Ligand SMILES: Cc1ccc(C2CC2)c(-c2ccc3c(c2)CCCO3)c1[C@H](OC(C)(C)C)C(=O)O
């Protein structure tokens with residue numbers, strides 16, 4: 001279903017990478033955050049929900065979503081309730097950039113543009129077809 | 132044309148808001164940054180280019196794009212070279228959030244979802260039709 005996203009954090013070089021996957025397409029958005037806090041998750045959810053029609057979010061660590069701030073973001077935005085493949089690409093490009101966050105965005109770019117159509121093409125088509 | 136984006140910064144409460152507009156659709160993405168630096172622009176461009184097929188970027192301040200770092204981001208990602216309407220929405224929601232960045236993302240959400248189809252629906256349809 002086109003409104004379903006998966007959200008998890010993974011750890012690399014002492015930092016935290018927030019990873020959202022549009023399950024139907026494999027399309028990813030990621031951000032490096034200082035550490036795993038409800039406030040960072042909430043803010044990320046608000047950002048994500050303004051870009052895509054986010055209906056439901058799943059996670060592999062349900063305690064991620066217990067904070068008052070996360071609950072508020074989901075309430076306002078109308079939301080109801082690959083780490084290895086992305087880490088692979090990050091490793092392939094890591095030497096080309098100083099900052100981990102730079103390498104993360106290169107890896108998201110490479111993943112979303114890779115033809116199996118690409119994840120970036122699939123999400124756009126899935127969402128348009130739903131309209 | 133579906134690959135064209137506009138990128139500018141605007142100022143509010145002593146902070147800097149980076150605003151990207153998909154010109155064909157009116158769809159917006161925004162981020163609050165500390166101040167206007169080439170590095171922040173470069174990083175934003177890398178993020179944007181992994182989400183959408185960004186072909187060309189325009190700006191109203193051409194000196195925005197002179198830094199070595201911006202040029203590198205455009206090179207790697209294959210890129211070649213409303214402030215009032217968004218400030219209006221930010222003012223309408225500003226009291227509901229502590230942080231300006233939170234109010235900015237609420238305003239992006241409201242803008243992209245507003246039916247004139249919405250900007251969010253238009254960009255997804257324009258991009259899918261181009262495929
Ligand atoms: C810190 C820094 C300094 C200089 C550059 C470019 C040669 C000028 C880049 C950079 C700029 C763009 C770029 C890549 C690297 C690698 C390929 C993708 O595009 C970065 C970069 O940090 C940001 C925050 C992005 C400026 C990094 O972490 O090394």
Ligand SMILES: Cc1ccc(C2CC2)c(-c2ccc3c(c2)CCCO3)c1[C@H](OC(C)(C)C)C(=O)O
Nearest residue numbers: 039042043068069072073076227228229230233
């Ligand atoms: C700093 C802070 C504290 C508490 C909350 C929620 C009641 C718990 C929110 C919040 C959380 C979600 C939310 C809105 C506000 C307003 C409507 C949209 O959704 C924020 C918030 O900061 C972030 C970084 C987002 C946590 C802010 O700037 O006030």
Ligand SMILES: [Mg+2]
Nearest residue numbers: 007008009061
């Ligand atoms: Mg997690």
Ligand SMILES: [Mg+2]
Nearest residue numbers: 138139140192
């Ligand atoms: Mg500007």
